[PDB]
Design an enzyme around this catalytic site. Structure first.
Site, PDB file in Angstrom:
ATOM      1  N   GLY D  30       0.760  -1.235   0.000  1.00  0.00           N
ATOM      2  CA  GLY D  30       0.000   0.000   0.000  1.00  0.00           C
ATOM      3  C   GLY D  30       0.796   1.293   0.000  1.00  0.00           C
ATOM      4  N   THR D  31       0.064   2.404  -0.100  1.00  0.00           N
ATOM      5  CA  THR D  31       0.612   3.762  -0.089  1.00  0.00           C
ATOM      6  C   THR D  31       1.477   3.965   1.149  1.00  0.00           C
ATOM      7  OG1 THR D  31      -0.841   5.260  -1.363  1.00  0.00           O
ATOM      8  CG2 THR D  31      -0.158   5.981   0.848  1.00  0.00           C
ATOM      9  N   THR D  32       2.461   4.846   1.069  1.00  0.00           N
ATOM     10  CA  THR D  32       3.292   5.073   2.236  1.00  0.00           C
ATOM     11  C   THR D  32       2.702   6.200   3.093  1.00  0.00           C
ATOM     12  OG1 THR D  32       5.475   5.955   2.921  1.00  0.00           O
ATOM     13  CG2 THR D  32       4.827   6.257   0.608  1.00  0.00           C
TER      14      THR D  32
END
Lengths: 233, 250, 198, 244, 242, 243, 241, 111, 244
Positions: D30-32
Site C-alpha cells: 500500500g501507499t506510504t
C-alpha cells in the site's frame, strides 16, 4: 497457488491478496456499461440497459435513494438492491432523526463500511456489483464510484462495466469541458451519452435501451427512460 | 468468532475404532505410573512426583487430590486435564448431590459423574477427549471402601488393586502376586511402596513420592467439635516424613 | 355457574350438564352440550370461564386422540384423568390459568367397571360414586347421600338424577334450561335424548 | 507437512502465523504514510496516488480523527482501516462515558491492540490488512504509535509503513539523530512533507496528492487538525525544493 | 469443502450456476404476453402411464390477477408460491388494492439469495439456492399485461415471450420469430401449444400439456383439458393447411 | 487426518502439535528472563532489546504490573503477552471484589493455567504462544514464583528462568542452591537480591549489560514495582565494584 | 448450532444427498398400492435376513395416520417413524382447527413438505424414505392414493410401487391395470395386488401382508390364511395352463 | 406517577365537495389554560394529493403524520412510484394506528 | 474456516448407507456378547463381561445389565459410557410417563423413545452416533413379557431370543436351533449359558465373567420381579447346568 487461497474471503494469499473479492470485482466488468459525470450544478447518470432476449426487457440499472441522491449499478442486480436499500434507510434516518439530508460523501463511507464487513468474516461473500452514486447536497454536485472491495472514490466523471474504459478515456479528456456545463442540464446529459457511446461496439443506444438520471441545484433526482430520452439518441 | 465447531471431533473409523480416544489412551501410557490398593479397612493411592526441574517446588504440585472428605483421586496422563477434572469433580459433588441430600456422594456415584464429563468430551462438538485416566478411592457408609479407574472413553471399573501409566503392566503383575483379601491398610501401603519402587528411576523417598489413604475418620482433621455425627475425614495424605518412616521398613 | 353432575352406578357413569349459555343479560343458547368425548369409552363434562372452557376441553380431546392413534390403544380412565389433572396443575401456576372444572366419566374395559373423576381448575382430583362442580353439589349431595346405592341400575341412576335436577330447578335462582344426559358403559357413549320429560 | 498457512489461527511448526504474515504483504503493497512525534505533539502524513485527472482533488481524505484529540492514518486495505477506526471511536466514546476524561493515547493504543490481536485467535476471521500510525496529546505529553496486523504495537519517535517505508524510515532516523532536543510542530510538518515526497520515488510512476494533519499542544491546543491552505502549500514547496 | 456462497474465478456464484443446470433438466414452460392477456403453458411430463396426469400442478394461481409456471425441481417452488400468495394477500390487506405484478415478482426474488451457512448480511437460513425457475404473469392497471422470468439468482427479467426448461433454447428461438406486438390471445394460445409440441419428447395432447392465461376481465384461469383438446385440433388443422 | 496438526486434537502418538508449536513461539522474541526469591522479596530480570532507533525505548517492556502485589513477566510475542496481561488484571480485580482479599500469586497462576488448558481442548481457541512468570510476596506463602505455559501447566519455583538460553541460566542457579543448601538468596535488601540476580544472569549468559539492556521488577510486602534505567545503573555500579 | 449445508448442488445440477436418499429407498422392502373402484389396497413384502421374530410386537409396515388414512413406506425405518409422528400430529391439529379431518391430498402435501424442507436446511440430511399414502376424504367414497419421495415431490397414482424390484412390479401393474375398469371389487383388487407382489416375493406366505381400506374409516389387515388363500388360487391360475 | 399523555386542544374539520375536498384546523396549540403558540400548523400536505391531520395529543399527532408521510415515500420506492390512492392511504393509516392498539396514538385523525 | 475439519457424521454413502452407523455397528461387534431369551413364564438376560482381571472387583461391578424400571431391564453391547447416557434418559422417560398417567410405561413406548433419540444423531447435529446396542427385557399388562433390540441406527425389533455383540451369527444360529415356544425360564436360562459357552472367545466360561438377570412373575405373589444374579448365584447355576 490461487486455487488454494480463493476458497473464501477470510483467506489471504501468499502475496497479500483476497481472491474472492477480486472474483467479485470480475462480475462488475461482466456487467453492462454505465457512466457518471457532473458540472457544478448537476450530476448525471447514463446507463446502458442490457436485454436478455429480443423478447425481454432492458433491466433497470438506476435506483433512486432519496430526493437528492441515486445510483447506477453494474453487476449482480440483487446486490445492488440490497446496497441501495441500505442507502435508502441511511438517507431516511438522517431526515427523520436529524431533519438533515445525508451528505453524498457520508453515504459513501456507509457503503464502504457495509461492504468491508463482507470481506473479513467467514461464511459471507463480497458483494458482486459496482455502483456510481450522484447527488446534490450542501456542498454541490457529487459523483462517487463504489467497488465491492469497499473502495469508494469521488470523481468528476467515470464509467464501470464492460468496455467502460472507452467512456472513461473520453471523460478524462472532455474534463475541462463538461466540468463547466453549469446551468444547462441537457448539455451535461448529451456529454454523458457521448461518453457512454465510447464503450459501444455491439449496437447503438436505442430508445428502450437508453436510461438517464439527473439531480442538481433545483432538480430532484429523476429517472428518464424511453421516449423521455429519445431527444438524446 | 463464536465456536463454529459444533460437530464431533471424535468419530468412528471403518474398523470401528474411535481414534481420538485411542490416542488419548496412548497419552495416558506415557504418563508417570500411579496405583491403588484396597485393604480390608482402607485404600491407598500413590504416584511419583516427577519434578520437571530441581528449582521447581514439588510440594506446590499435588498429583493426589481430595474430592470430598472420604474420596481421593490420582492420575496418569496430562496433568492440566486432570486439574480441571478435579475442579469439576469437586463442584459436581456439591451441585448434584450435597446441595440436594445434605451429604457427600458415595464413591461410585461421584465416579459416575466424572465419567459422564469425560464421555461428553468424546461426543460433544469441537472438543478432544481428556488425556488422562484416574484412580478414585473412597468410602461411604453403605458401600464401605472402594477403588475405581476412569478412562478417557468415560468407562470406569472397580478394582481390588491396579496401576495405570508407564509401567502399569509390570505393576499390575506384581500386585496380583502380593494382593489377598485379608490385607490390613499398612500392608497395602507397604505393598504400594514396593510396587512403586520398580517404576521409579531416580530418588525414592517421601519427597519424590506422593501417597494418600482412605481409612478411619480423622477427628483431629475436622477443625471443630460439638457435632457427634461429624468425626472427621477419612481421606488423609501422608507426610514426607511418614513415607520415609515406612521406606526404612521396606 | 352451569350444572355439572355425575353419577357412577353399577355398570355405567351418567353425566348431566345444563344447556343454558348466558352472557350478561341474555340467554344466548339453551341447547349447549358442555361435553367432549375423549375416547370411545371416556367422556368429559366441563364448566367455568367463558372461552377457556371449550378451548381446554378440545385441547384435551386432541391429545387423547393423538395418543390413541400412536399406540392403537385406549388409555384407561384413570390414566386419562391423571393426564388431565397434570395439565390443570401446570395451568394453575402459569401466566393465565385455565379456569375450567371437569367431570371425567369412563368405562374401564380392562377392569370392567365404570369410573367417575372430579377435577377442579387447581388440579384437585378425586374419585367418587357421584360428584358435581359449583353450587350443584350444595343442592344435590344430600339427595345422593341418601338414595345412592353401588348396585343401582342405569335406570335407577337416571331416576336419582331426575330427582336431583328437580331439586335444582326448584331452589336454584338461575334458569339453566334443563340438562343433557349421557351414559358411558361397556358399549360406549350414548345420549338419553328423552330427559325433557322422562 | 503443509497447509499451516490456510487457517488464520494455526501455528506453523516454527511458531508463526502465516495468515498474519500474508496480511503484512497487503500492508507493504500500500501507499506510504508516516508519523513524526515533535516536542509537544505529533504530525501525520500520507501519500495519495492520483489514479487519474477524474479524481476530485482534496476530496478523498484518508487521515481520520478519533474523539477530538487523536489522529489515525494507515497503509494497506483501506476499508480495513476505516473498520479499525470505527472500533476506536466506540472504544473512545465508551472510555470517556465512564471516566469523563478523554482517552489517554497509551490506553487507546491498547484498545486497538487487543482488538486487532483478537483477529488472530480464530480461523473464522481474517487478520487486518493494514498498519496504523496514530497518536495525540494527553494528560502527560504527546504519543506516537504504530500497530501491525499481528496486533503488535510500540511507541515511536517516528514511524512509517507502506511502499516507501524504507526511505521514510531512513529520513526519520536522520531527524532523530540530528535533533536530540526534539523537532517542533511547525518543523515536523514540513519535514513530514519532505519524507513523503522522497518516499514517493518507490512509486514515482503515478502522480500523487499530499495530506498532512497534526496535534500540537501549542499549535492546535491538543486538538487534531488538518493542515490546509498556506501552511500546507508552504510545506509542499519546502519538499519540492529539497527534492532537487 | 467450499462455501455455498463462494465466487468462481469468473465472478459467478457456483451454487447458483449449478442451480441453473438442474433447471435445464426440467419440463418446458412457455409464456407469451399480448395486449389481450398473457398465456402460460407447460409440459406435464408424467413418468409412467399409471400416474394420474391431472395431479401434476405446474401452473399455480398467485392471486386473481397473477399466476405462474415453474420448471426444475418443482418441490422447491412450494414455499416460493406460498411466499408469493402471502405477499399478494398481505399487500391487499395493507393497501386495499392489488399488488403490482412487478412488486410481487421482486418479493419472490428477495428469497432467492437468502442462502448460505452464515452470510454476514442478516439471517439467510436456507442451505442452498432454489432449483426451480418461474414464469410469473399477470396484469395491473399501471403496466398492463406482464410476463416475468424469476431465477434462483435473485434477478428477474421481463419478456414479451419466454421459454424455460429442457427445450428452452430451441423454443426461445421459435418465439423470437413468431412474436409480434399485435398477437391475439387466440394466436398466442395456438403458438404456445405449437412450440410445446416441437420440444416435447411426447406427442402433445390435452393430457401431457396444460394451458392457462390471465386477462384483465376474468383473471387467471387454467384451461381444463376439454378446452385445450379443441385448441390442439384447431392447431393440427391450421398446420396441415400448409 | 493431517489436520491433527492444525487444531488441538490428539495425534496417533497422543500428542498435541499445536501446543508444541505454541511453545516454539514463546522464544520468538529471543529474550531471556529469570526470577529469584530473597528473604522477603522476589526479583525478576529480563533482557530488554530495542532494535529500531525510531522506537520509544520507554514503551518496550515485557514485564507487567498485574495488581498492587502481583507482577508478571512474559516470554513470547507482545500481542499475546498483552492479551494475557489484560486478562490477568481483570481476573485479579474481580477476585478482590468477590472474595474480599487480594488474589494470591499461585491462585492467579492456576486460574491462567486453567484458561490455557481450555485452548488445549476446544478446537476454536488457539493457545497463546507465551510463558507467564508470576511473582509477589504472598501474605501467607511469602516470596512466590509461579509460571505457566501453553500446555496449561504451572508450578511453583525456588527460582526459575525462561527463554532461548533457559537451560544455561537454570543450571547456573541450580548449582548455586546445591551449594548454599537453602531455597533462597539470604539477603535482607532487595537491592542485593537484584544484584545477585543480574550477576548470575551475566555468568550464565557470558554477557555484560548496560543500564538499557535490562528490565527489573521487584515484589515486596504489599507492593510490586519495576526499576528505572537509573535504579538499574546504580545496581550495575555496585556489581562492578566487586569484580 | 450445527448448520452445515449437506444437501447442495453439484456441477451437473444434482443434489447427491437427495439422490443417495433414493438409493436407500431402492434398498427398502417393496411396497405397492392399487386403487379399486371403491377401495385402495396396500401390499408389503417381508424381508428374511433374520427370522425368529415376534410378529405381534415388531412394528408393522402400514401405519394409520388417522382413522381414514394410512401410510406405508420403503427405505430407512427409523426415518419413517419421524414422518409418521409428524403426520399423525398434523392430522389432529387439522381436526382441531378446521373442524374436519384431513383430505388424503392435504396429508400427502404435508409429509412431502417436511421432506422437501430436509433437503435445503443446514445441519440435516434428507429422509431416506418414500411413501404411499391412501384413504378416503371425509364424507367421500372416491379412493385416493399418493406417493412422496426424498426430494419432496408427490402425485397421485392408480397403482404404484416403491422399493427393491419396484421396477419389475411396476411393469406388471402397467400391463395389468386398466383405468377403464379398475378392480371393481375388494377381492379382485386384493388379488391384482398379491399377483404383482408374487412377481418379486418368491413364495412369501409370511412375506406378504395386505391391508384393505374402504370408505368411512373402514380399514382392516388380512391374516396369513386370508392372504395365503389368494396365493393358492393364483398359483393354480398359472398351473391351469 | 408519570402520565405519557397530554391534550393540546385544537379542532379540525373535513368536507368533501364533488370534485374537491377541504381539511381545516385552527392554529392554536394549548396546555391546560396556557397558549403554547397562536400559529402551529396542524393540517399537512403529505404528497400524492393527500392532506392529513391528527388532532388531540400533539406528540402522538406528529409521530403519526411523520410516520404516514414516510409511508408514502416507501410506497413509491416499493411500487414503481405508483400514486397512493386515498382509499389505500386510509387502509394504511388503519394499520399504523392499530399497530399501537395497546398504547394508542391519542389522536382523532382525518385525511 | 471450520468446514475443513467437519467429518459430516450424518451423510449418505453413494450406496445410500450411513457411514457412522455402519462403523458404530462394527464397533459393537467386538463387544462382549449379550443374550436375550423369552420364555412363557419369564425372560432371561445373560452377558459376557469383556476383559477382566484377578483384581477386578466383580461384586461391585455392572457393565452389561442395567435396571431401567421395576419391569424393564436392558443388556448392553458397546461403549459403556455411551450406554449410561442413554440409560439415564431412559429411566427419566419412564418416570415422566408414570407421573403423567399413573401407570408404568408400556415396554415398547420406552423402547421407541430411546430409539428415536438414537435416530436423531443420525439425521442432524453433526455429532457421532452412540456406539451402543440394547436388548430390552420387560413386562407390561398389554403384551406381557417382551424382548426388543435397538442399535446405532435407531431401528428396533421384537424377538423370542436374540443376541448382540460379538459372534452374533454363531449365537443366533445356536438359538434358532434349540429354542422352542413352549420353553420355560429354567430352560431359557440353560440355553443362554450354553450359547455363550460355545461362542466365548475365552478359554472356559467362569462366573467371574458373567452377568445374569431374569424377569419372572413369581407364582407366589402375582407381580413381576427382576432378579440380577449375584456372583455366587451365577457360580451355582453354572454348576447345575453342568458347566461347573
Amino acid at each position: 497457488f490461487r486455487n488454494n487461497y480463493d476458497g473464501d474471503t477470510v483467506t489471504f494469499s501468499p502475496t497479500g491478496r483476497l481472491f474472492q473479492v477480486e472474483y467479485a470485482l470480475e462480475a462488475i466488468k461482466q456487467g453492462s456499461v454505465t457512466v457518471g459525470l457532473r458540472s457544478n450544478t448537476h450530476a448525471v447518470l447514463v446507463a446502458l440497459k442490457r436485454n436478455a432476449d429480443e423478447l425481454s426487457s432492458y433491466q433497470k440499472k438506476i435506483i433512486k435513494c432519496d430526493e437528492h441522491m441515486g445510483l447506477s449499478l453494474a453487476g449482480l442486480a440483487p446486490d445492488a438492491r440490497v446496497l441501495s436499500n441500505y442507502l435508502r434507510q441511511q438517507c431516511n434516518y438522517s431526515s427523520l432523526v436529524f431533519n438533515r439530508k445525508l451528505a453524498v460523501e457520508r453515504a459513501g463511507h456507509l457503503l464502504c463500511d457495509k461492504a468491508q464487513k463482507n470481506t473479513q468474516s467467514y461464511g459471507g461473500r463480497p458483494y458482486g456489483v459496482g455502483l456510481l452514486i450522484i447527488g446534490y447536497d450542501k456542498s454541490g454536485a457529487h459523483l462517487l464510484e463504489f467497488q465491492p472491495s469497499g473502495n469508494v472514490t469521488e470523481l468528476y466523471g467515470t464509467a464501470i462495466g464492460a468496455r467502460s474504459q472507452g467512456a472513461k478515456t473520453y471523460l478524462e479528456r472532455t474534463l475541462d469541458t463538461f466540468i463547466k456545463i453549469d446551468g444547462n442540464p441537457d448539455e451535461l446529459i448529451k456529454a454523458g451519452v457521448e461518453a457512454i457511446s465510447q464503450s459501444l461496439r455491439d449496437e447503438s443506444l436505442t430508445v428502450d435501451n437508453l436510461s438517464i438520471a439527473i439531480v442538481g441545484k433545483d432538480t430532484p433526482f429523476t429517472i428518464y427512460d424511453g421516449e423521455a430520452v429519445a431527444k438524446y439518441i | 468468532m463464536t465456536d463454529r465447531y459444533s460437530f464431533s471431533l471424535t468419530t468412528f473409523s471403518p474398523s470401528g475404532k474411535l481414534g481420538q480416544i485411542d490416542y488419548a489412551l496412548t497419552a495416558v501410557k506415557q504418563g508417570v505410573t500411579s496405583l491403588g490398593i484396597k485393604a480390608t479397612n482402607g485404600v491407598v493411592i500413590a504416584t511419583e512426583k516427577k519434578s520437571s526441574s530441581p528449582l521447581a517446588m514439588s510440594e506446590t504440585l499435588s498429583k493426589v487430590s481430595l474430592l470430598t472428605p472420604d474420596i481421593g483421586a490420582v492420575y496418569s496422563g496430562m496433568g492440566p486435564d486432570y486439574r480441571v477434572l478435579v475442579d469439576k469433580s469437586r463442584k459436581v459433588a456439591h451441585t448434584s448431590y450435597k446441595r440436594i441430600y445434605g451429604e457427600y456422594p458415595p464413591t461410585k456415584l461421584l465416579v459416575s459423574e466424572v465419567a459422564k464429563i469425560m464421555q461428553e468430551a468424546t461426543q460433544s462438538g469441537g472438543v478432544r477427549p481428556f488425556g488422562v485416566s484416574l484412580l478414585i478411592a473412597g468410602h461411604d457408609e453403605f458401600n464401605g471402601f472402594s477403588l475405581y479407574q476412569v478412562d478417557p472413553s468415560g468407562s470406569y471399573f472397580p478394582w481390588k488393586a491396579t496401576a495405570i501409566g508407564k509401567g502399569s503392566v509390570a505393576a499390575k503383575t506384581f500386585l496380583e502376586k502380593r494382593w489377598n483379601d485379608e490385607l490390613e491398610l499398612e500392608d497395602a501401603i507397604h505393598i504400594a511402596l514396593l510396587t512403586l519402587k520398580e517404576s521409579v528411576e531416580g530418588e525414592f523417598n517421601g519427597d519424590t513420592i506422593e501417597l494418600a489413604i482412605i481409612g478411619d475418620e480423622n477427628p483431629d482433621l475436622l477443625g471443630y467439635t460439638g457435632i457427634p455425627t461429624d468425626k472427621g475425614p477419612r481421606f488423609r495424605k501422608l507426610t514426607s516424613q511418614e513415607i520415609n518412616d515406612r521406606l526404612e521398613a521396606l | 355457574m352451569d350444572i355439572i353432575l355425575g353419577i357412577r352406578v353399577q355398570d355405567s357413569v351418567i353425566l348431566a350438564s345444563s344447556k343454558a349459555v348466558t352472557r350478561g343479560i341474555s340467554v344466548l343458547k339453551d341447547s349447549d352440550d358442555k361435553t367432549r368425548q375423549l375416547s370411545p369409552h371416556t367422556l368429559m363434562s366441563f364448566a367455568g370461564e367463558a372461552g377457556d372452557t371449550v378451548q381446554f376441553a378440545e385441547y384435551i380431546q386432541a391429545n387423547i386422540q393423538l395418543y390413541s392413534i400412536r399406540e392403537d390403544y385406549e388409555l384407561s380412565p384413570q390414566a386419562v384423568s391423571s393426564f388431565v389433572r397434570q395439565e390443570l396443575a401446570k395451568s394453575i401456576r402459569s401466566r393465565r390459568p385455565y379456569q375450567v372444572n371437569v367431570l371425567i366419566g369412563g368405562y374401564d374395559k380392562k377392569k370392567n367397571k365404570p369410573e367417575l373423576y372430579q377435577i377442579d381448575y387447581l388440579g384437585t382430583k378425586v374419585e367418587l360414586p357421584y360428584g358435581a362442580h359449583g353450587y350443584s353439589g350444595f343442592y344435590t349431595f344430600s339427595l345422593l347421600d341418601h338414595h345412592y346405592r353401588p348396585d343401582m341400575t342405569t335406570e335407577e341412576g337416571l331416576d336419582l338424577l331426575k330427582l336431583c335436577v328437580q331439586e335444582l330447578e326448584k331452589r336454584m335462582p338461575m334458569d339453566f334450561k334443563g340438562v343433557i344426559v349421557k351414559i358411558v358403559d361397556k358399549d360406549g357413549i350414548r345420549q338419553v335424548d328423552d330427559f325433557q320429560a322422562q | 507437512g503443509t497447509g499451516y498457512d490456510l487457517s488464520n489461527s494455526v501455528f506453523s511448526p516454527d511458531g508463526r502465523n502465516f495468515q498474519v504474515e500474508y496480511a503484512v504483504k497487503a500492508v507493504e503493497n500500500g501507499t506510504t504514510s508516516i508519523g513524526i512525534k515533535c516536542n509537544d505533539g505529533v504530525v501525520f502524513a500520507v501519500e495519495k496516488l492520483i489514479t487519474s485527472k477524474l479524481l476530485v482533488p482534496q476530496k478523498n481524505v484518508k487521515i481520520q480523527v478519533v474523539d477530538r484529540h487523536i489522529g489515525c492514518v494507515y497503509s494497506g486495505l483501506i476499508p480495513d482501516g476505516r473498520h479499525l477506526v470505527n472500533r476506536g471511536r466506540e472504544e473512545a466514546a465508551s472510555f470517556k462515558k465512564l471516566y469523563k476524561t478523554p482517552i489517554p493515547i497509551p490506553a487507546f493504543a491498547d484498545r486497538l491492540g487487543q482488538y486487532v490481536q483478537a483477529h488472530t485467535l480464530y480461523n473464522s476471521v481474517r487478520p487486518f490488512g493494514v498498519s496504523t500510525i496514530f497518536g495525540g496529546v494527553d494528560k502527560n505529553g504527546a504519543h506516537l504509535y504504530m500497530l501491525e496486523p499481528s496486533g503488535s504495537y510500540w511507541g515511536y519517535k517516528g514511524a512509517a509503513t507502506g511502499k516507501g517505508r524504507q526511505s521514510a524510515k531512513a529520513e526519520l532516523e536522520k531527524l532523530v539523530d540530528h535533533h536530540p532536543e526534539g523537532l517542533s510542530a511547525r518543523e515536523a510538518v514540513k519535514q513530514a512533507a519532505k519524507i513523503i515526497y522522497l518516499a514517493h520515488e518507490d512509486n514515482k510512476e503515478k502522480d500523487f496528492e499530499l495530506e498532512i494533519s497534526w496535534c500540537s499542544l501549542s499549535e492546535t491546543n491538543g486538538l487534531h487538525k488538518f493542515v490546509k491552505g498556506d501552511l500546507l502549500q508552504e510545506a509542499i514547496d519546502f519538499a519540492q525544493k529539497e527534492i532537487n | 469443502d467450499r462455501g455455498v456462497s463462494t465466487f468462481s474465478p469468473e465472478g459467478r456464484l457456483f451454487q447458483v450456476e449449478y442451480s441453473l443446470e438442474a433447471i435445464k433438466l426440467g419440463s418446458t414452460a412457455i409464456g407469451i404476453a399480448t395486449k389481450e392477456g398473457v398465456v402460460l403453458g407447460v409440459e406435464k411430463r408424467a413418468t409412467s402411464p399409471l400416474l394420474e396426469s391431472d395431479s401434476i400442478e405446474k401452473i399455480v394461481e398467485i392471486d386473481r390477477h397473477i399466476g405462474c409456471a415453474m420448471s426444475g425441481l418443482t418441490a422447491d417452488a412450494r414455499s416460493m408460491i406460498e411466499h408469493a400468495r402471502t405477499a399478494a394477500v398481505t399487500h391487499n390487506l395493507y393497501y386495499d388494492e392489488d399488488i403490482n405484478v412487478e412488486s410481487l415478482t421482486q418479493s419472490v426474488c428477495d428469497l432467492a439469495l437468502r442462502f448460505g451457512e452464515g452470510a454476514s448480511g442478516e439471517e439467510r437460513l436456507m442451505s442452498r439456492p432454489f432449483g426451480v425457475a418461474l414464469l410469473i404473469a399477470g396484469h395491473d392497471a399501471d403496466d398492463g399485461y406482464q410476463l416475468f422470468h424469476a431465477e434462483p439468482s435473485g434477478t428477474f427479467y421481463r419478456y414479451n415471450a419466454k421459454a424455460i426448461g429442457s427445450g428452452s433454447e430451441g423454443a426461445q428461438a421459435e418465439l423470437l420469430n413468431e412474436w409480434h406486438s399485435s398477437l391475439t390471445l387466440k394466436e398466442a394460445e395456438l403458438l404456445v401449444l405449437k412450440i410445446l409440441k416441437q420440444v416435447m419428447e411426447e406427442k402433445l395432447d390435452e393430457n401431457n400439456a396444460q394451458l392457462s392465461c390471465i386477462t384483465k376481465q376474468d383473471g387467471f384461469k387454467i384451461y381444463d383439458n376439454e378446452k385445450t383438446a379443441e385448441l390442439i385440433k384447431e392447431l393440427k388443422e391450421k398446420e396441415a393447411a400448409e | 487426518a493431517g489436520y491433527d496438526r492444525h487444531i488441538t486434537i490428539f495425534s496417533p502418538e497422543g500428542r498435541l502439535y499445536q501446543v508444541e508449536y505454541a511453545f516454539k513461539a514463546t522464544n520468538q522474541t529471543n529474550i531471556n528472563s529469570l526470577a529469584v526469591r530473597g528473604k522477603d522479596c522476589t526479583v525478576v530480570i529480563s533482557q530488554k532489546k530495542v532494535p529500531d532507533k525510531l522506537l520509544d525505548p520507554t514503551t518496550v517492556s515485557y514485564i507487567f504490573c498485574i495488581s498492587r502485589t502481583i507482577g508478571m513477566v512474559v516470554n513470547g510475542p507482545i500481542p499475546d503477552a498483552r492479551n494475557a496481561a489484560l486478562r490477568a488484571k481483570a481476573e485479579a480485580a474481580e477476585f478482590r471484589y468477590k472474595y474480599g482479599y487480594d488474589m494470591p500469586c499461585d491462585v492467579l497462576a492456576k486460574r491462567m493455567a486453567n484458561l490455557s488448558q481450555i485452548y488445549t481442548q476446544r478446537a476454536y481457541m488457539r493457545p497463546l504462544g507465551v510463558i507467564l512468570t508470576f511473582v509477589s510476596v504472598d501474605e501467607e506463602l511469602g516470596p512466590s514464583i509461579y509460571k505457566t505455559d501453553p500446555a496449561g501447566y504451572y508450578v511453583g519455583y525456588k527460582a526459575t528462568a525462561t527463554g532461548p538460553k533457559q537451560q544455561e541460566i537454570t543450571t547456573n542457579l541450580e548449582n548455586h542452591f546445591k551449594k548454599s543448601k537453602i531455597d533462597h538468596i539470604n539477603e535482607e535488601s532487595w537491592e542485593k537480591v537484584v544484584e545477585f540476580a543480574i550477576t548470575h544472569m551475566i555468568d550464565a549468559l557470558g554477557t555484560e549489560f548496560s543500564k538499557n539492556d535490562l528490565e527489573v521488577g521487584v515484589a515486596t510486602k504489599d507492593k510490586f514495582f519495576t526499576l528505572s534505567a537509573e535504579n538499574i545503573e546504580e545496581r550495575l555500579v555496585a556489581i562492578a565494584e566487586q569484580d | 448450532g450445527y448448520d452445515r449445508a449437506l444437501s447442495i448442488f453439484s456441477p451437473d445440477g444434482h443434489i447427491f444427498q437427495v439422490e443417495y436418499a433414493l438409493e436407500a429407498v431402492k434398498r427398502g422392502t417393496c411396497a405397492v398400492g392399487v386403487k379399486g373402484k371403491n377401495c385402495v389396497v396396500l401390499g408389503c413384502e417381508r424381508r428374511s435376513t433374520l427370522k425368529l421374530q415376534d410378529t405381534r410386537i415388531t412394528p408393522s409396515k402400514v401405519s394409520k395416520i388417522d382413522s381414514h388414512v394410512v401410510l406405508s413406506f420403503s427405505g430407512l425405518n427409523a426415518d419413517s417413524r419421524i414422518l409418521i409422528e409428524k403426520a399423525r400430529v398434523e392430522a389432529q391439529s387439522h381436526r382441531l382447527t378446521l373442524e374436519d379431518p384431513v383430505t388424503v391430498e392435504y396429508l400427502t402435501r404435508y409429509v412431502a413438505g417436511v421432506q422437501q424442507r430436509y433437503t435445503q436446511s443446514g445441519g440435516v440430511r434428507p429422509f431416506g424414505v418414500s411413501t404411499l399414502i391412501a384413504g378416503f376424504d371425509p364424507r367421500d367414497d372416491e379412493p385416493k392414493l399418493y406417493q412422496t419421495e426424498p426430494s419432496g415431490i408427490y402425485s397421485s397414482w392408480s397403482a404404484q410401487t416403491i422399493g427393491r424390484n419396484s421396477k419389475t412390479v411396476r411393469e406388471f401393474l402397467e400391463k395389468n391395470y386398466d383405468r377403464k375398469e379398475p378392480p371393481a371389487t375388494v377381492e379382485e383388487c386384493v388379488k391384482l395386488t398379491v399377483r404383482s407382489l408374487l412377481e418379486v416375493v418368491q413364495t412369501g406366505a409370511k412375506n406378504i401382508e395386505i391391508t384393505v381400506v374402504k370408505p368411512d374409516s373402514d380399514i382392516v389387515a388380512l391374516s396369513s390364511e386370508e392372504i395365503n388363500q389368494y396365493v393358492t388360487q393364483i398359483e393354480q391360475e398359472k398351473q391351469e395352463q | 406517577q408519570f402520565n405519557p399523555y397530554g391534550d393540546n386542544g385544537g379542532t379540525i374539520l373535513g368536507i368533501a365537495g364533488e370534485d374537491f375536498a377541504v381539511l381545516a384546523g385552527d392554529t392554536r396549540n394549548i396546555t391546560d389554560y396556557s397558549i403554547n403558540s397562536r400559529y402551529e400548523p396542524k393540517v399537512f400536505d403529505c404528497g400524492d394529493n393527500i392532506v392529513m391531520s391528527a388532532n388531540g395529543f400533539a406528540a402522538d399527532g406528529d409521530a403519526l403524520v411523520k410516520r404516514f408521510k414516510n409511508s408514502v415515500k416507501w410506497y413509491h420506492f416499493d411500487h414503481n412510484d405508483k400514486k397512493l390512492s386515498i382509499n389505500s392511504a386510509a387502509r394504511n393509516i388503519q394499520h399504523l394506528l392499530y399497530g399501537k392498539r395497546f398504547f394508542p396514538y391519542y389522536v382523532h385523525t382525518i385525511i | 474456516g471450520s468446514r475443513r475439519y467437519d467429518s459430516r457424521t450424518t451423510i449418505f454413502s453413494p450406496e445410500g448407507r450411513l457411514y457412522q452407523v455402519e462403523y458404530a455397528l462394527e464397533s459393537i461387534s467386538h463387544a462382549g456378547t449379550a443374550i436375550g431369551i423369552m420364555a412363557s413364564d419369564g425372560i432371561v438376560l445373560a452377558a459376557e463381561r469383556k476383559v477382566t482381571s484377578t483384581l477386578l472387583e466383580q461384586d461391585t461391578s455392572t457393565e452389561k445389565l442395567y435396571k431401567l424400571n421395576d419391569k424393564i431391564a436392558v443388556a448392553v453391547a458397546g461403549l459403556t459410557a455411551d450406554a449410561e447416557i442413554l440409560i439415564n434418559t431412559a429411566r427419566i422417560h419412564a418416570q415422566n410417563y408414570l407421573k403423567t398417567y399413573n401407570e408404568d410405561i408400556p415396554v415398547e413406548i420406552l423402547v421407541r423413545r430411546l430409539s428415536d433419540i438414537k435416530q436423531g444423531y443420525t439425521q442432524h447435529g453433526g455429532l457421532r452416533p452412540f456406539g451402543v446396542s440394547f436388548i430390552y427385557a420387560g413386562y407390561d399388562d398389554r403384551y406381557g413379557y417382551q424382548l426388543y433390540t435397538s442399535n446405532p441406527s435407531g431401528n428396533y425389533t421384537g424377538w423370542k431370543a436374540i443376541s448382540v455383540g460379538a459372534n452374533t451369527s454363531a449365537a443366533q444360529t445356536l438359538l434358532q436351533m434349540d429354542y422352542k415356544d413352549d420353553m420355560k425360564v429354567d430352560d431359557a436360562i440353560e440355553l443362554a449359558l450354553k450359547t455363550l459357552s460355545k461362542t466365548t472367545d475365552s478359554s472356559a466360561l467362569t462366573y467371574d465373567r458373567l452377568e445374569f438377570a431374569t424377569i419372572r412373575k413369581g407364582a407366589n405373589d402375582g407381580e413381576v420381579y427382576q432378579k440380577i444374579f449375584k456372583p455366587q448365584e451365577i457360580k451355582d447355576i453354572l454348576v447345575k447346568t453342568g458347566i461347573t
